[PDB]
Amino acid sequence: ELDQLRQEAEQLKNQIRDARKACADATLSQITNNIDPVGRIQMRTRRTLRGHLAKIYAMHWGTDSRLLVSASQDGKLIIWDSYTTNKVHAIPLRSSWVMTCAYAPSGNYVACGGLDNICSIYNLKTREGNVRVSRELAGHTGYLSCCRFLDDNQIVTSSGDTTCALWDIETGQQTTTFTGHTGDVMSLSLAPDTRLFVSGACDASAKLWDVREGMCRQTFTGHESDINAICFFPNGNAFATGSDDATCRLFDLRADQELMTYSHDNIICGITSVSFSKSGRLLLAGYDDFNCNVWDALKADRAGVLAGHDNRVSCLGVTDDGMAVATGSWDSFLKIWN
Amino acid sequence: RNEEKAQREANKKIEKQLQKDKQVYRATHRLLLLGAGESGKNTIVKQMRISGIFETKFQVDKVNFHMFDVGAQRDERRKWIQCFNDVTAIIFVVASSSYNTNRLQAALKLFDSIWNNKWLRDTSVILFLNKQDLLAEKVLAGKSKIEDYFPEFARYTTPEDATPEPGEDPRVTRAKYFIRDEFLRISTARHYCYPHFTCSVDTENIRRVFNDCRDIIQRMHLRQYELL
């Protein structure tokens, strides 16, 4: 009774793809071909946060738009004061291999995950001034690739065991576990409403997961290479994925399609980080070719370059108000571009 | 403004601590323990001492070594291997005595795949062969033969430069060096492969790593100064 199951699975998959094809009638590029402003944007650095020991893999902006967190290869979290290029905190990690860090929206906690299979929760604002590990999140059998904060006590994680997982900081237990990936999942993009989130995997198929119901609402194929990064559009209906095939794939959760692809002949390296502006007008993408090309989501093309890094651009983030964009690379330097 | 000047003073203290651990990191050579599950890697870390990542530490002649073993991983796709680029060398640990698919072929495939990995271009492998004893009670005993399903190993004999230090038996040495050059083919086909022979437990193994590293960086410097 397995052959019939495969038959039904592929039948419904192809009827899904036919439903998508019927739903899709026109592309987004030709919709917006009429207008073409902000064709060339200039954002000089003016801010370079130096002090990280080793290669930086992840960073996250604070909701206050002034405070930042970044993780380094040696196992060091640095809380930065972005406005004045200051170190706010220095957290030495138990595991010397971290590949994701996140900053709580409330500003009290920092999530930290890597090869240790754990997303460690550090409390920035304890009764004492010492950042302390308020809660280790264990239960993943693969390397933890991205754990973003849902709430002050509720968090979402993405690990190397093809399984994303919701967790409660109060109990530390994996709540409403959900897996739908065949290849391991490397990044998740959280919606502003904190009720949905989209995660990308080596399967080259993004998955939209509902927080409350806790199982896959929607799947998005379309990437010719491994997915490395994902950001969710501020409007709440779209999201962009950065990948090893040098293509930024912008899908929409509505209508189950790909809105656009952002690629060029010059770029052949992988895309390691992706973020959107405050209005989502610019798609800022990190590349393995020492460069952070600023693409224009609306203009269907690259509008600007954030070059100035001496190694692989591994992480970048646009602050909540969109005032500036931080960008971490492997040269141990994280530079803010305004 | 005194609050802001105190922001600077806290920044300076943090940066001083960061410089201290910068010196610590510079004075340390990172290693990546690698191998299969049936191998003796765990035994080795015990001699080193005497979640997902195991941060084993050991010091030899005032040289720190962080040998990192991946305990709980998917073992289907090695995408985290990109995170190891600064490692001095990656420890490849394989059980030589596979008896009579067979795990020698799987180990060879893993070694070839991790040798041809571009994330590890400037990375030298120091390969360890364990189960010298378990090879001894197999090849010398003769309960299981290697010629049963290997067409090769019959036209191959001990090389003239082979050094049988244990001297247990010519057959044992022949099989062991067949394993050695079977592994080294891939490496011979910027980086080096350092084959070593050992049993499950050995103190000299730790020293071996040091010696291997004392070559790698040296050459890495020789190539850096156009000396090699």
Partner: single-chain antibody
Framework: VQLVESGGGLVQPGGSRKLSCSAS????????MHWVRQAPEKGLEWVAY????????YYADTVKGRFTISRDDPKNTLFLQMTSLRSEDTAMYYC??????????????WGQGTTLTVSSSSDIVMTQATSSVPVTPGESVSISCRSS???????????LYWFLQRPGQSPQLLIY???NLASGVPDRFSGSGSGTAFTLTISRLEAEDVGVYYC?????????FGAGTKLEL
Amino acid sequence: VQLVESGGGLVQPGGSRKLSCSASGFAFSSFGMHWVRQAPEKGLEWVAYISSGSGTIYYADTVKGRFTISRDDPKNTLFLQMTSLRSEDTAMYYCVRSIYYYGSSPFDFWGQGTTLTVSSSSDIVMTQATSSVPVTPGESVSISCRSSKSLLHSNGNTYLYWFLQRPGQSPQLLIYRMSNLASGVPDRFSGSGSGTAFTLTISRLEAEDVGVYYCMQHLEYPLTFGAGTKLEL
């Protein structure tokens, strides 16, 4: 987080005393220590200040080289050496914690305190409207504070602090800078400042509001204190 203070007592004029402030249950290695003393019948006063790493050390204008301040992180202790004790040098001394990372809560926690009985310009003027007023419960209470300069720094940080310490006990912290309320105190408190005149507003009142308030600035560093408004029930 506990602070235990030791030393003090009857001292002959011109004497030297080693006041001690030990930290128990927490580590002060990243904490700046401020030696704010309480006058027995007047407002609080600051004399000395040491940074977390002892990089920056400040003293009051009245006591610049007379006092000596040291911190021992391994022992988690603060030592205050005082020489040539005059009859005026009597106060209810307190050791104050204050960490200065962005968004922190300066002057959050105060020690138990010690008493010390002794025998016989550029400084900003920090003034409050009144000193005492009878208050009925429930109705909103407004306290006015004034400074001889504009506390709104170019970065936008108006350095003002309220403490509202009950008589004869460790001062607390109510609000710091602008419209920033410590999670320990109830949300009913609020602060409003034009830039030179400032108002502390209290929506509802209970038994905890009884006591004297205090107003501090931090733009420059003389740490001038206000007169102090007393609320009695």
